[PDB]
Amino acid sequence: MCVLANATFPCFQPPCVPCCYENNAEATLRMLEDNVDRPGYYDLLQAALTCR
């Protein structure tokens, strides 16, 4: 339920899966930023930074 551009992707499973931050830092920070008020934000922060 997190809104990036028009993705409307589910907050569990990132559109950039895996290693979102490693691909494009700026874009990831934007993606997180856009969904600050969404009640599900912390599924996006739980998905976005951490990766193997």
Partner 1 sequence: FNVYKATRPYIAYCADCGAGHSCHSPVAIEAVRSEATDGMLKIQFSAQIGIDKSDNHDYTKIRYADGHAIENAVRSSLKVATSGDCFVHGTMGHFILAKCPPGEFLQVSIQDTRNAVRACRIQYHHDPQPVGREKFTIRPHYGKEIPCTTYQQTTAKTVEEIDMHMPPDTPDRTLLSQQSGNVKITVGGKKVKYNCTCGTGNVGTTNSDMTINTCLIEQCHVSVTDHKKWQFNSPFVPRADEPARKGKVHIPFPLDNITCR
Ligand X SMILES: *[C@@H]1O[C@H](CO)[C@@H](O)[C@H](O)[C@H]1NC(C)=O
**Contact indicator for 1, 41 with CB cutoff of 8 Å:** no
C-beta of 20: minimal distance to ligand X in Å? Answer: 17
Residues 21-50: x/- map of binding to partner 1 (CB under 8 A)? x---xx--x--xx--x----xx--xx--xx
Q: Does 29 sit near ligand X (CB under 6 A)?
A: no
Q: Which of residues 2-21 bind ligand X (CB under 6 A)?
A: 5-6
One DSSP character per residue, 8-51 reads ---TTS-TT-S-HHHH-HHHHHHHHHHTSSSTTHHHHHHHHS--
Chain residues binding ligand X by CB under 6 A are 5-6
